[PDB]
Write an enzyme that holds these catalytic residues in place. Sequence first.
Site, PDB file in Angstrom:
ATOM      1  N   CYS A 120     -30.119  -2.935 -54.234  1.00 19.99           N
ATOM      2  CA  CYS A 120     -30.886  -2.093 -54.944  1.00 19.99           C
ATOM      3  C   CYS A 120     -30.101  -1.423 -56.177  1.00 19.99           C
ATOM      4  O   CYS A 120     -29.013  -0.999 -55.912  1.00 19.99           O
ATOM      5  CB  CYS A 120     -31.457  -1.002 -54.055  1.00 19.99           C
ATOM      6  SG  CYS A 120     -32.767   0.204 -54.889  1.00 19.99           S
ATOM      7  N   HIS A 163     -40.972  -4.079 -51.978  1.00 19.95           N
ATOM      8  CA  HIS A 163     -39.582  -3.501 -52.158  1.00 19.95           C
ATOM      9  C   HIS A 163     -39.792  -2.553 -53.492  1.00 19.95           C
ATOM     10  O   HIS A 163     -39.691  -1.385 -53.516  1.00 19.95           O
ATOM     11  CB  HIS A 163     -38.553  -4.210 -52.772  1.00 19.95           C
ATOM     12  CG  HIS A 163     -37.063  -3.528 -53.137  1.00 19.95           C
ATOM     13  ND1 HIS A 163     -36.296  -3.542 -52.211  1.00 19.95           N
ATOM     14  CD2 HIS A 163     -36.995  -2.875 -54.261  1.00 19.95           C
ATOM     15  CE1 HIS A 163     -35.042  -2.876 -52.733  1.00 19.95           C
ATOM     16  NE2 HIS A 163     -35.649  -2.410 -53.930  1.00 19.95           N
ATOM     17  N   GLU A 164     -40.500  -3.048 -54.544  1.00 22.20           N
ATOM     18  CA  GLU A 164     -40.876  -2.360 -55.798  1.00 22.20           C
ATOM     19  C   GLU A 164     -41.820  -1.281 -55.536  1.00 22.20           C
ATOM     20  O   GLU A 164     -41.943  -0.096 -56.045  1.00 22.20           O
ATOM     21  CB  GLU A 164     -41.085  -3.089 -56.756  1.00 22.20           C
ATOM     22  CG  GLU A 164     -39.942  -4.042 -57.384  1.00 22.20           C
ATOM     23  CD  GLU A 164     -38.773  -3.201 -57.501  1.00 22.20           C
ATOM     24  OE1 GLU A 164     -38.918  -2.067 -57.758  1.00 22.20           O
ATOM     25  OE2 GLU A 164     -37.512  -3.825 -57.116  1.00 22.20           O
ATOM     26  N   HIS A 167     -40.606   1.879 -53.910  1.00 26.58           N
ATOM     27  CA  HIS A 167     -40.166   2.664 -54.894  1.00 26.58           C
ATOM     28  C   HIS A 167     -41.298   3.843 -55.388  1.00 26.58           C
ATOM     29  O   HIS A 167     -40.939   4.771 -55.567  1.00 26.58           O
ATOM     30  CB  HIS A 167     -39.415   2.138 -56.089  1.00 26.58           C
ATOM     31  CG  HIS A 167     -38.107   1.727 -55.849  1.00 26.58           C
ATOM     32  ND1 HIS A 167     -37.108   2.456 -55.383  1.00 26.58           N
ATOM     33  CD2 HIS A 167     -37.645   0.429 -55.812  1.00 26.58           C
ATOM     34  CE1 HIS A 167     -36.180   1.762 -54.994  1.00 26.58           C
ATOM     35  NE2 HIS A 167     -36.507   0.335 -55.524  1.00 26.58           N
TER      36      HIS A 167
HETATM   37  C1  LIG Z   1     -27.274  -6.849 -48.993  1.00 21.26           C
HETATM   38  N1  LIG Z   1     -27.763  -8.114 -49.484  1.00 21.26           N
HETATM   39  C2  LIG Z   1     -27.700  -8.666 -50.527  1.00 21.26           C
HETATM   40  O1  LIG Z   1     -27.478  -7.975 -51.752  1.00 21.26           O
HETATM   41  C3  LIG Z   1     -28.212 -10.263 -50.746  1.00 21.26           C
HETATM   42  C4  LIG Z   1     -26.858 -11.032 -50.799  1.00 21.26           C
HETATM   43  C5  LIG Z   1     -27.304 -12.304 -50.868  1.00 21.26           C
HETATM   44  C6  LIG Z   1     -28.589 -12.806 -51.278  1.00 21.26           C
HETATM   45  C7  LIG Z   1     -29.484 -11.873 -51.082  1.00 21.26           C
HETATM   46  C8  LIG Z   1     -30.984 -12.342 -51.263  1.00 21.26           C
HETATM   47  C9  LIG Z   1     -29.402 -10.465 -50.991  1.00 21.26           C
HETATM   48  N2  LIG Z   1     -30.479  -9.564 -51.207  1.00 21.26           N
HETATM   49  C10 LIG Z   1     -30.935  -9.232 -52.368  1.00 21.26           C
HETATM   50  N3  LIG Z   1     -30.407 -10.109 -53.322  1.00 21.26           N
HETATM   51  C11 LIG Z   1     -31.060  -9.559 -54.794  1.00 21.26           C
HETATM   52  N4  LIG Z   1     -30.322 -10.343 -55.811  1.00 21.26           N
HETATM   53  C12 LIG Z   1     -30.031 -11.686 -55.645  1.00 21.26           C
HETATM   54  C13 LIG Z   1     -29.079 -11.910 -56.993  1.00 21.26           C
HETATM   55  N5  LIG Z   1     -29.886 -11.859 -57.940  1.00 21.26           N
HETATM   56  C14 LIG Z   1     -29.381 -12.100 -59.181  1.00 21.26           C
HETATM   57  C15 LIG Z   1     -28.025 -11.912 -59.289  1.00 21.26           C
HETATM   58  C16 LIG Z   1     -27.273 -12.228 -60.567  1.00 21.26           C
HETATM   59  C17 LIG Z   1     -27.938 -12.556 -61.678  1.00 21.26           C
HETATM   60  C18 LIG Z   1     -29.265 -12.909 -61.514  1.00 21.26           C
HETATM   61  C19 LIG Z   1     -29.929 -12.619 -60.277  1.00 21.26           C
HETATM   62 CL1  LIG Z   1     -31.649 -13.010 -60.274  1.00 21.26          CL
HETATM   63  C20 LIG Z   1     -30.492 -10.515 -58.241  1.00 21.26           C
HETATM   64  C21 LIG Z   1     -31.445 -10.169 -56.990  1.00 21.26           C
HETATM   65  N6  LIG Z   1     -31.929  -8.668 -54.960  1.00 21.26           N
HETATM   66  C22 LIG Z   1     -32.205  -8.073 -53.589  1.00 21.26           C
HETATM   67  N7  LIG Z   1     -33.411  -7.254 -53.749  1.00 21.26           N
HETATM   68  C23 LIG Z   1     -34.122  -7.139 -52.694  1.00 21.26           C
HETATM   69  S1  LIG Z   1     -36.064  -6.855 -52.957  1.00 21.26           S
HETATM   70  C24 LIG Z   1     -35.327  -6.761 -54.956  1.00 21.26           C
HETATM   71  C25 LIG Z   1     -33.970  -7.358 -55.039  1.00 21.26           C
HETATM   72  C26 LIG Z   1     -33.192  -6.880 -56.378  1.00 21.26           C
HETATM   73  O2  LIG Z   1     -33.667  -6.997 -57.388  1.00 21.26           O
HETATM   74  N8  LIG Z   1     -32.332  -5.770 -55.779  1.00 21.26           N
HETATM   75  C27 LIG Z   1     -31.743  -5.391 -56.812  1.00 21.26           C
HETATM   76  N9  LIG Z   1     -31.864  -8.433 -52.333  1.00 21.26           N
HETATM   77 NI    NI Z   2     -34.743  -1.064 -55.545  1.00 22.09          NI
END
Ligand SMILES: CNC(=O)c1cccc(C)c1Nc1nc(N2CCN(c3ccccc3Cl)CC2)nc(N2CSC[C@H]2C(=O)NC)n1
Ligand code: NI
Length: 193
Positions: A120, A163-164, A167
């Site tokens: 997040c 998730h959104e 919020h």
């Molecule tokens: C603790 N584990 C982890 O961090 C985790 C760890 C591994 C896999 C996952 C899947 C995890 N989980 C998770 N990974 C993400 N990113 C993966 C990377 N990606 C991204 C990153 C960089 C450039 C472009 C992009 Cl696209 C962005 C999104 N995002 C979210 N959340 C959960 S719902 C909303 C979403 C969100 O945007 N969060 C800020 N969860």
């Molecule tokens: Ni969030």
Amino acid sequence: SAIERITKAAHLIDMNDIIREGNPTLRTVAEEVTFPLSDQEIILGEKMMQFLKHSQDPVMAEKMGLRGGVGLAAPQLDISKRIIAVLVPNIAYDLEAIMYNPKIVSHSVQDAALGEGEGCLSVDRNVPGYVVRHARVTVDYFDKDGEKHRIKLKGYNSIVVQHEIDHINGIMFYDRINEKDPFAVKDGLLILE
Ligand SMILES: CNC(=O)c1cccc(C)c1Nc1nc(N2CCN(c3ccccc3Cl)CC2)nc(N2CSC[C@H]2C(=O)NC)n1
Ligand code: NI
């Protein structure tokens, strides 16, 4: 106000606009928007989507110092309105939407959680554990023209939209992690990986 500042033509949303854990706004229930939308409310949604696209562009993210994201909610910008942006790339996009007053109107009995946990933008630490959500959801929302959409989501898309929406209801992802046993797998819980 935050909305007035963020919706200036010259402004690109960056990490400095994103409020962090402890800010009361993240724990407040956001207010419904009314239709027709103001120009500012439309611009805000557009700026939020632009942020997501910038954060997913390696070159731009580096230049702007962005952490990558696939969703953003207005309360994360200190704006207590029911406005979210979602942008899930296909592993160009599996889901791209700016949603006004989004609402889950149906959900599966089956639960799901990301195997790798959730991250997040407002949380600058790692909080381990399965974040338990509905596997499948039906979501109603309005677009910028006030037209109603009703969509069905599963897999990653379903997780991101839930998730959104959390919020805009003052809910954080770790609220849904099993306190005693973060990696417990109950009957009926799908682990996505
Ligand atoms: C603790 N584990 C982890 O961090 C985790 C760890 C591994 C896999 C996952 C899947 C995890 N989980 C998770 N990974 C993400 N990113 C993966 C990377 N990606 C991204 C990153 C960089 C450039 C472009 C992009 Cl696209 C962005 C999104 N995002 C979210 N959340 C959960 S719902 C909303 C979403 C969100 O945007 N969060 C800020 N969860
Ligand atoms: Ni969030």
